[PDB]
Design a protein around this ligand. Sequence first.
Ligand SMILES: NC[C@H]1CN(c2ncnc3[nH]cc(-c4cccc(CO)c4)c23)CCO1
Length: 248
Amino acid sequence: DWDLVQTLGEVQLAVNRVTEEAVAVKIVDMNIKKEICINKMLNHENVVKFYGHRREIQYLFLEYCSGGELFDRIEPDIGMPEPDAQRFFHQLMAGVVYLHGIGITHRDIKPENLLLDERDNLKISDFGLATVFRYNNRERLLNKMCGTLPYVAPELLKRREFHAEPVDVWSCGIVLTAMLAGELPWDQPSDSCQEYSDWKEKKTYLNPWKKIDSAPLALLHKILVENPSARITIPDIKKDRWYNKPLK
Ligand SMILES: NC[C@H]1CN(c2ncnc3[nH]cc(-c4cccc(CO)c4)c23)CCO1
């Protein structure tokens, strides 16, 4: 038996009447079948845990993350301490490597979908837009536009089909930019976007790039690459100098 204590954002905080264990419950009014199936596949310390579901309407039982969303740890126009950003980025990569390893792409990575537990461990949240991109070791290209414009990779806007993995890598790059600068670089990654044009012309003397140290900036130079085929992959991110730099 669970008491619904408060609304978290609909999602409510449920507390067990006997054990007082707290979980989050997602309530949807009547595709949900897919989200549940994907959630049932998921088991990793940087992915929100799925506990089960009950039907009537539909209820999803999810790991409660008391630290809230990463979004709220980001100070507008400033960001956060670089060591905090690195630690969160490490954990983000951990989660994303896990997902890609089981053939799942999140497709909407952004700070609103990155939660923190009581120890400030990052948890990737919400698989409502996620999909399978590898099955029986065979990759399938994506073609549906999904995600959130400031975070989407340029190939989603220009190409009919594209690989799932570089898209998630890109959005993680924008998250990192936000964590380090406290702002998003562009409304969308298109040529009609002056700030995107400037980035492509390497005007890093402009904001948000001017606020970012050269070492993390060098990593961003390899992530925010327009050609998804030339974009740095995760295995190579893990070899990056800043990624491996000891920090406070
Ligand atoms: N805007 C606040 C946000 C909070 N979010 C959660 N907060 C605390 N623990 C949680 N566990 C699971 C969720 C959650 C469930 C479904 C979607 C999302 C959004 O990324 C989070 C959660 C609940 C939603 O609102």
